[PDB]
C-alpha cells in the first residue's frame, strides 16, 4: 500500500537498467486491470448500451460511465495538493518575516510553524503526484479501449466507405491520441481547479491588500481572455494541417513500400520534389501555429512585474507599502499566475482537444457497417455499382467448377466480390453458403511465418497441410530456406518473389475448409508449366468435390470448366458450357542550421545585458526590514525581468522549425539514396511511424520544449548570479543542492533513454499490424478471420502497453523523487530548520522553487530528444543497346545465397532477348542486378561503358522498367504518368491512346485529373499493367528490362502489348520476362535461368 503510493517498485528496473541493456525480459509484463482484452470488453459493452438505449450516440458518456469515478478520485487529491500549494506562501511569508529584530505578534512561533510547513510540504508531496499518475493510468486505459474500439470498427468497415479513407488517415488518427491522450488527463482537470485556487487566492490578496486584488484580477482575466483566443485560433493552424500530414505520410508510405520501383524509375528527385511540396505547406501552418503556442505559452513569464505593479499601486499609492506584504504579495500572485495563465488555458485546450479527438473517433465508429445475410449457389439479375456489372446470371450446383473469363475491365474480381458479399448488388440476389474461400488476384502475405500465411489462424493439420504444400508445388521453394517450413516473411511478402506469393496465396485459400472457392486469377504470376501442374494437381484433384468459382482466360481451363461465363463491359456475353460454346544528439541538432546558433547567440547576448543591467539597478538601490528583502524581491520578479519577448523566443521558434524542415528533408533524401539492402533490413510500418512521429514532434512538441527549457535556464542562471553577485553565500548554498539534482538525472536518464527507444521502437508493430489489416481486409472478411486478427492486435497492444506504462512509471519515480523528495526532504526541512546565517540559506528554497521547474523541463526535453536521435541515426546511411556481361553474382546480403553464379552473355543491339526460368529462378534478380540494385558483381559494358565508368544514376537513366510489383502513388494520372511533367498532356494523351486507357481513364469523372487513391485501387489489374506500359512508352530510353509486361492480361488485351512492342520500341533491345508463350514466340533470343545459371539459346526450336 506505500509501495505504489512511493512507486518504490521500479527500484527493480532502475537498478537493472542503471547497468546493463532492457531488451526484452526486464520489461514487466502487463497487469490484469489494464488489459487490452478487459479495457476494450468494457468500453464495447457500454458503447453498445449507448447505441442501443440513447438517441444521439455519444462516445462520451461511454467513456464517463466507465473512468468519472477514478476520475474524481485522482482529481479531489489533485486539487487538495494545489490546495497546499496555494496555502504554502502565507506560512512562508509569515516564517521569512521572523528575520529581523522587529518581534510585532511574532514571538517564538517560528519553531512552531516551520514544522507545519513542513508537514504541507510533505503532504504536497504524498498527494501530488499520486494523482498525476493516476491520471496518466486513466488517460493510458482509455487510450487502450478506445484503439481497440477503433481496430473492432476497421475490421467491420464497409468496402465502399474505405474506397476514401486510407492509411494516413488512421496513422495521423493514433499518431496524436497515443502520446497526447494519457498526458492530458493530468492536465485537464484543472478546468474546474483553477477557479477555485484563484477564488482562495483573490481572498487571501483582498485578506492582505484591502482593494487591488481585484483591479490585479481584471488585467489578468484579460490576459487570460486574450490566451483563450490565441489556443481558439491555434485550433485552426492544426485543423488545417492534419490533413496535409496525413496526405504526405501517406504519398511517403506508398513511395517507400515501392522504393524498389521508385529506384528502378529513377524516381527520386522527383518523388522528393514531390513531398516537399505538401512539406512546405504543412511548415506555413506549423510556423503559424507554433508562432501563435509562443505567445500563448510567453504570457506567464511577461506578466508577473506587471500584475506585482497593477497590485501594488493602487495600494501603495496612497496606503504606503513595505517590503514584506510586497513580498507576500509577489508569492501569492506567482501561484495567481500560475494558475490563472499556465493552468487554466493549459486544461480549456486540454479538454477542447480531448472532445475533439473523441468527436472524431465516435465519428469513425459510427460509419456504414458491413452487412451479410447444398450450396447451389444461385444468381438472378444482379447489377452492381455506370454499373460494373449488368443482368449477370448464373446457378451452380456442388463439386461444379465454373470459370469467369472476359476482357480486361469487365469485371470478373467484382462479381467475385459480389459473390463474396463486399460490393452492394442494387438489384437481385445472391444464394450460397456463408462459408467462402478466397485467393486475390494480388497476392497477399501478412508478416509472419509461411506456416501461419498458409494456415490462417486455424487448427494445424499436418495430412492436409502436407497435402496442400504438395500439390500447389511449393514444397521445392519451402525446402530451401534456413528454416525448412516455419520461415519468417517480411510485410508484404517483399522476400519472396511474385510466383511464390501468388503460391503461397492460393495454398491459404486451399487450405480452409469451405463450400465455396472463390480462385480470382490464381496462376498470374506463374509460368506455363507450374500453372499447368497447380490446375491438374490442386484445382482438379484435390479439391474435385466441391463447388469452385476461377477467374481464367485460357482456352484448357474453359474447356475443364463444367459452365462457362464469359464478361465483356460487366454484360454476360455468355453462360453455358464449352461445348455449347464451340457452335552529440545534441551537438548535431544545433549544429544542423548556421542560423540556430546565431539565434542562441542573439539571445545569451541580450539575456548578458539584461542580467547586467538588473545588477547595477540592484547595486544602486542597496535598513532592517528592506536591507534583505530586496534580493526576494528580485528572484520572485525575476521571471519578467528575464523573460524572452518577441525579439528572442520568435526567432529561436522559426529556426527550431526550419531545423526540422532541413532534418525531414536530409531524411527524405538519404531513404530515397539508401541501398537496397539497408531498405530491406528495416520494415514498411517502421518507416511509416518514424515518419508520422519523429518528424511531427520535432515540428511541434520540440521548439516549444526547448524554448521553456532555455526560458528556465536563463531565469535560474540570472537570479543565481545577479544574487550570489552581491551575496556569494546564496552560489555557496546551491551548489549541494543542484549536485544532488543532477547526480539523479544522471542516474535515471541512462535508464530513461532505453525506456523511451524501447517505446519507440515498440509503436510501429501496432501500426505495422493496422496496415496489414486494412491491406488485406478483403480476405479477411471474406475467410472470417475477424476473432484472429483481433487477438493479434491485442497482442499487439499488450506489448507496447506494458513498456509504455512501464516507462511512464519510471519517470513518474524520477518526477516525484526529484521535486517531492529531494527537495522536500533536503531543502524544506533542514533549510528552515535551522532557526539560529538564515538569510544566505532560504533564498535557496524560492530559487530551487523553480529550479526543479527548470530541471522537469530539461528531462522533458531529453525524453523528445529520442526522436532526433532516431532521425539522425536514419540520416547517417550510406549512399547501339549492346551489352556484355561477365562474373555477374547477384546476393541480396553480402553472406546470403548468391541468386546468380558468374552468369555471362552478349546482346546484339535490337535484339528482342527473351527470359525464361520457372518461378522463384532469379529472373527478376537478374533484371534487378542490370540496374544494381541489389549488390551484384562483375560488369554490364553496354556499348563500352562499364558499371564503374559511370554513376548510377546516368547508369540506370539507360533503362526501361516495368516492376512486377506495380507502383501507383497517390495522384492525378498526369502525375502518375510523369512526376517530373516533361510532356505534356497532348503528348501523353497519345501513350493513353495504342496501350488502352483511352475507354478507362475518361471512364472516371477526371481525364488525367481523377486522384488514385488506395494504391490506384479504382483501375484493375489489367488497367494497372497498361499504366505501367504506358508509363515505359512515354520514358522513352533503350534496353528496356520489361518484366512480365502482361502479367494479367488476356490475348484480347495481350495485342495491346504486342503492337505496343513492335511499334513504339521499333529498334532497341528488349529483356522481357513474359511468362505467355504467345510473347515468347516472336522473341529472338532466349535466356533460361535453370540450376541458378543462365544459358544462351538463338530459337524456340532450339529451345525445344
Ligand atoms: N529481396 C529479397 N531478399 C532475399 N531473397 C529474395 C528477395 N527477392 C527475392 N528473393 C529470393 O531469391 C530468389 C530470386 O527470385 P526472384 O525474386 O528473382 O523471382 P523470379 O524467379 O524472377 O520470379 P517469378 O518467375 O515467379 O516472377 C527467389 O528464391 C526469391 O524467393
Ligand atoms: N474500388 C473501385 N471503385 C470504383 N471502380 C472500381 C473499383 N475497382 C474496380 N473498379 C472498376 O470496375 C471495373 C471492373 O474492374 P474489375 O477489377 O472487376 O476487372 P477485372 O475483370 O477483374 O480485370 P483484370 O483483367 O484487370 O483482372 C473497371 O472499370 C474498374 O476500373
Ligand atoms: C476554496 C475557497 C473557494 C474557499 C472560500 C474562499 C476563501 C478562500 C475566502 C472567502 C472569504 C475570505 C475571508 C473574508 C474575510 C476575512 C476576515 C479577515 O480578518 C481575515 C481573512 C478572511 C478570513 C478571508 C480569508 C479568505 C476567505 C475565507
Ligand atoms: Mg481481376
Ligand atoms: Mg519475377
Same mark, same amino acid.
Given at each position: 500500500v506505500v509501495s505504489k503510493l512511493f512507486f518504490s517498485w521500479t527500484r527493480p528496473i532502475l537498478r537493472k537498467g542503471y547497468r546493463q541493456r532492457l531488451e526484452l525480459s526486464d520489461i514487466y509484463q502487463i497487469p490484469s486491470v489494464d488489459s487490452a482484452d478487459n479495457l476494450s470488453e468494457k468500453l464495447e459493452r457500454e458503447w453498445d448500451r449507448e447505441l442501443a438505449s440513447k438517441k444521439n450516440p455519444k462516445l462520451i458518456n461511454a467513456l464517463r460511465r466507465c473512468f468519472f469515478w477514478r476520475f474524481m478520485f485522482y482529481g479531489i487529491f489533485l486539487y487538495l495538493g494545489e490546495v497546499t500549494k496555494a496555502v504554502q506562501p502565507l506560512l512562508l511569508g509569515r516564517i521569512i518575516a521572523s528575520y529581523d529584530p522587529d518581534n510585532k505578534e /511574532?514571538?517564538?512561533?517560528?519553531?512552531?510553524?516551520?514544522?507545519?510547513?513542513?508537514?504541507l510540504f510533505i503532504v504536497r508531496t504524498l498527494l501530488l503526484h499520486p494523482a498525476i499518475f493516476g491520471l496518466h493510468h486513466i488517460g493510458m486505459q482509455m487510450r487502450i479501449a478506445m484503439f481497440s474500439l477503433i481496430y473492432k470498427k476497421t475490421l467491420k468497415l464497409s468496402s465502399r466507405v474505405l474506397d476514401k479513407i486510407s492509411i494516413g488517415q488512421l496513422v495521423s488518427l493514433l499518431s496524436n491520441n497515443l502520446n497526447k491522450f494519457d498526458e492530458g488527463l493530468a492536465l485537464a482537470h484543472f478546468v474546474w481547479i483553477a477557479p477555485l485556487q484563484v477564488a482562495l487566492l483573490m481572498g487571501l490578496i483582498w485578506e492582505l491588500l484591502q482593494a487591488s486584488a481585484f483591479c490585479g484580477l481584471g488585467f489578468l482575466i484579460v490576459l487570460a481572455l486574450f490566451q483563450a483566443g490565441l489556443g481558439r485560433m491555434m485550433m485552426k493552424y492544426r485543423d488545417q494541417r492534419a490533413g496535409k500530414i496525413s496526405e504526405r505520410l501517406v504519398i511517403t508510405s506508398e513511395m517507400i513500400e515501392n522504393i524498389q520501383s521508385v529506384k528502378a524509375y529513377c524516381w527520386e528527385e522527383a518523388m522528393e520534389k514531390m513531398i516537399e511540396n505538401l512539406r512546405q505547406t504543412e511548415l506555413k501552418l506549423t510556423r503559424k501555429a507554433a508562432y501563435v503556442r509562443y505567445f500563448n505559452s510567453s504570457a506567464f513569464f511577461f506578466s508577473g512585474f506587471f500584475v506585482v505593479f497593477l497590485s501594488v499601486l493602487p495600494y501603495a499609492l496612497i496606503k504606503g507599502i513595505i517590503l514584506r506584504k510586497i513580498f507576500t504579495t509577489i508569492s501569492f500572485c506567482i501561484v495567481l499566475r500560475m494558475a490563472v495563465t499556465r493552468q487554466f488555458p493549459w486544461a480549456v485546450q486540454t479538454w477542447y482537444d480531448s472532445l475533439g479527438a473523441i468527436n472524431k473517433i465516435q465519428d469513425f465508429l459510427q460509419k456504414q457497417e458491413y452487412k451479410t445475410l447444398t450450396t447451389e449457389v444461385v444468381m438472378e439479375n444482379v447489377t452492381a455499382f455506370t454499373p460494373v456489372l449488368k443482368d449477370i446470371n448464373f446457378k451452380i450446383e456442388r463439386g461444379q467448377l465454373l470459370a469467369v473469363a472476359g476482357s480486361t475491365g469487365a469485371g470478373k474480381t467484382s462479381l467475385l466480390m459480389v459473390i463474396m458479399g463486399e460490393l452492394e448488388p442494387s438489384e437481385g440476389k445472391i444464394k450460397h453458403s456463408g462459408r467462402i474461400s478466397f485467393c486475390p488476384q494480388f497476392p497477399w502475405i501478412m508478416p509472419g511465418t509461411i506456416k501461419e500465411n498458409i494456415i490462417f489462424g486455424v487448427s494445424y493439420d499436418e495430412y492436409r497441410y502436407r497435402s496442400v504444400i504438395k500439390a500447389c508445388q511449393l514444397e521445392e521453394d519451402i525446402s530451401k530456406f534456413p528454416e525448412k517450413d516455419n520461415t519468417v516473411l517480411g510485410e508484404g511478402g517483399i522476400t519472396l518473389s511474385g510466383g511464390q506469393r501468388a503460391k503461397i496465396s492460393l495454398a491459404r485459400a486451399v487450405y480452409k475448409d469451405a463450400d465455396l472457392y472463390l480462385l480470382d486469377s490464381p496462376f498470374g504470376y506463374l509460368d506455363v508449366l507450374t500453372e499447368k501442374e497447380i490446375f491438374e494437381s490442386c484445382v482438379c484433384k484435390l479439391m474435385a468435390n466441391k463447388t469452385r468459382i476461377l477467374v481464367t482466360s485460357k482456352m484448357e481451363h474453359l474447356k475443364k470448366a463444367d459452365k462457362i461465363l464469359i464478361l465483356h463491359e460487366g454484360s454476360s456475353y455468355f453462360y453455358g458450357t464449352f461445348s455449347e460454346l464451340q457452335n552529440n544528439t545534441y551537438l548535431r541538432y544545433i549544429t544542423v542550421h548556421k542560423s540556430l546558433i546565431f539565434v542562441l547567440i542573439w539571445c545569451l547576448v541580450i539575456f548578458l545585458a539584461e542580467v547586467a543591467a538588473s545588477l547595477v539597478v540592484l547595486w544602486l538601490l542597496g535598513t532592517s526590514t528592506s536591507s534583505y528583502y530586496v534580493f526576494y524581491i528580485y528572484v520572485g520578479v525575476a521571471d519578467t525581468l528575464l523573460a524572452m519577448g518577441f525579439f528572442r523566443g520568435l526567432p529561436l521558434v522559426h529556426t527550431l522549425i526550419t531545423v526540422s524542415k532541413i532534418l525531414h528533408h536530409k531524411m527524405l533524401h538519404s531513404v530515397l539514396q539508401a541501398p537496397m539492402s539497408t531498405l530491406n533490413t528495416l520494415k514498411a510500418g517502421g518507416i511509416l511511424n518514424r515518419f508520422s512521429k519523429d518528424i511531427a514532434i520535432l515540428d511541434d512538441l520540440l521548439p516549444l520544449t526547448i524554448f521553456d527549457f532555455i526560458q528556465l535556464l536563463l531565469i535560474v542562471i540570472g537570479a543565481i548570479a545577479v544574487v550570489a553577485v552581491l551575496q556569494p553565500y546564496i552560489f555557496?548554498?546551491?551548489? *549541494?543542492?543542484?549536485? @544532488?539534482?543532477?547526480?539523479?538525472? @544522471?542516474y535515471f536518464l541512462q535508464t530513461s533513454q532505453q525506456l523511451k527507444q524501447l517505446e519507440s521502437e515498440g509503436r510501429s508493430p501496432i501500426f505495422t499490424h493496422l496496415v496489414t489489416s486494412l491491406k488485406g481486409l478483403w480476405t479477411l472478411r471474406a475467410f472470417g478471420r475477424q476473432p484472429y486478427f483481433e487477438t493479434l492486435f491485442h497482442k499487439a497492444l499488450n506489448l507496447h502497453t506494458a513498456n509504455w506504462f512501464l516507462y511512464l512509471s519510471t519517470l513518474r519515480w524520477f518526477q516525484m523523487r526529484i521535486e517531492m523528495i529531494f527537495v522536500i526532504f533536503f531543502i524544506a526541512v533542514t533549510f528552515i530548520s535551522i532557526l539560529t546565517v538564515g538569510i544566505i540559506l532560504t533564498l535557496a528554497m524560492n530559487i530551487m522553487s523553480t529550479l526543479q521547474w527548470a530541471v522537469n523541463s530539461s528531462i522533458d526535453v531529453d525524453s523528445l530528444m529520442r526522436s532526433v536521435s532516431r532521425v539522425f541515426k536514419f540520416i547517417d546511411m550510406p549512399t547501339g543497346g549492346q551489352m556484355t556481361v561477365k562474373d555477374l553474382t547477384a546476393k541480396y546480403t553480402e553472406g546470403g545465397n548468391a541468386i546468380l553464379e558468374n552468369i555471362s552473355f552478349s546482346i546484339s543491339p535490337g535484339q528482342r532477348v527473351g527470359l525464361l526460368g520457372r518461378t522463384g529462378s532469379g529472373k527478376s534478380t537478374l533484371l534487378s542486378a542490370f540496374l544494381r540494385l541489389l549488390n551484384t558483381e562483375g560488369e554490364i559494358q553496354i556499348d563500352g561503358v562499364s558499371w564503374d565508368s559511370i554513376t548510377l544514376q546516368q547508369w540506370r537513366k539507360a533503362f526501361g522498367v516495368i516492376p512486377q510489383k506495380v507502383f501507383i502513388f497517390?495522384?492525378?494520372?498526369?502525375?502518375?504518368?510523369? *512526376?517530373?511533367?516533361? %510532356?505534356?498532356?497532348?503528348?501523353? %494523351? &497519345?501513350v493513353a491512346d495504342e496501350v488502352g486507357l483511352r475507354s478507362v481513364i475518361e471512364q472516371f469523372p477526371g481525364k488525367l485529373d481523377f486522384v488514385l487513391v488506395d494504391g490506384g485501387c479504382v483501375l484493375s489489374h489489367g488497367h494497372k499493367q497498361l499504366m505501367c506500359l504506358a508509363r515505359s512508352?512515354?520514358?522513352?530510353?533503350?534496353?528496356?528490362?520489361?518484366?512480365?509486361?502482361?502479367?494479367?492480361?488476356? *490475348?484480347?488485351?495481350?495485342?495491346?502489348?504486342?503492337?505496343?512492342?513492335?511499334?513504339?520500341? @521499333?529498334?532497341?533491345?528488349?529483356?522481357?520476362? /513474359?511468362?505467355?508463350?504467345?510473347?515468347?514466340? /516472336?522473341?529472338?533470343?532466349?535466356?533460361?535461368? /535453370?540450376?541458378? &545459371?543462365?544459358?544462351?539459346?538463338?530459337?524456340?526450336?532450339?529451345?525445344?
Open positions: /511574532e514571538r517564538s512561533i517560528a519553531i512552531y510553524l516551520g514544522i507545519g510547513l513542513c508537514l555557496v548554498a546551491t551548489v *549541494p543542492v543542484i549536485v @544532488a539534482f543532477i547526480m539523479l538525472r @544522471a497517390s495522384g492525378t494520372f498526369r502525375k502518375n504518368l510523369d *512526376p517530373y511533367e516533361q %510532356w505534356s498532356d497532348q503528348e501523353i %494523351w &497519345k512508352v512515354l520514358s522513352k530510353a533503350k534496353i528496356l528490362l520489361l518484366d512480365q509486361p502482361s502479367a494479367h492480361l488476356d *490475348p484480347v488485351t495481350y495485342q495491346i502489348i504486342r503492337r505496343t512492342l513492335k511499334q513504339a520500341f @521499333a529498334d532497341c533491345t528488349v529483356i522481357l520476362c /513474359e511468362h505467355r508463350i504467345e510473347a515468347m514466340l /516472336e522473341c529472338q533470343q532466349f535466356l533460361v535461368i /535453370e540450376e541458378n &545459371k543462365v544459358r544462351q539459346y538463338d530459337s524456340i526450336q532450339k529451345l525445344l
